[PDB]
Amino acid sequence: QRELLIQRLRAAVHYTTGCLCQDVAEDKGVLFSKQTVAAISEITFRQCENFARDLEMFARHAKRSTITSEDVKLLARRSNSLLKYITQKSDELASSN
């Protein structure tokens, strides 16, 4: 069950990774091997454990059970460019109205 769930989610991430790599391939004029795309998909899948656990802990740090844009922005804190980009996306969302 949980294992089927895992294989489901690996496959969905793998498909979405395939799409994104095709975009970078054309844009950069390179070809990504299937194994390369596979490897990137698996890295991304594994990373989610850290993202999830950090977010949870970041929200609990602020005494919240619910994760918010703030926690996500915090996650992006290491790269100045990344933090800048996510922050902007965050601001677009909050301005939704």
Partner: protein, 75 residues
């Protein structure tokens, strides 16, 4: 190309340790966006390494070369 909020939510829920934990709507969309930047950054850096090697083809060795630094900026 992009991650669906439903995929992202199940990915996160996989790893949550507290049963109370939830994600709000905007955060899900923001996280989807972060996951997509991550993938593209992985791909771009691996493409950059291959090109530095004078290659048009990106192999798993290019991914593994760039991974440690990548993980350094996505903390």
């Amino acid at each position: 190309g992009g991650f669906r909020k439903e995929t992202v939510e199940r990915l996160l829920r996989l790893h949550f340790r507290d049963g109370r934990t939830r994600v709000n709507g905007d955060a899900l969309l923001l996280m989807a966006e972060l996951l997509k930047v991550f993938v593209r950054e992985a791909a771009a850096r691996a493409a950059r390494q291959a090109q530095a090697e004078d290659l048009e083809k990106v192999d798993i060795e290019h991914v593994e070369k760039v991974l440690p630094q990548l993980l350094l900026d996505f903390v």
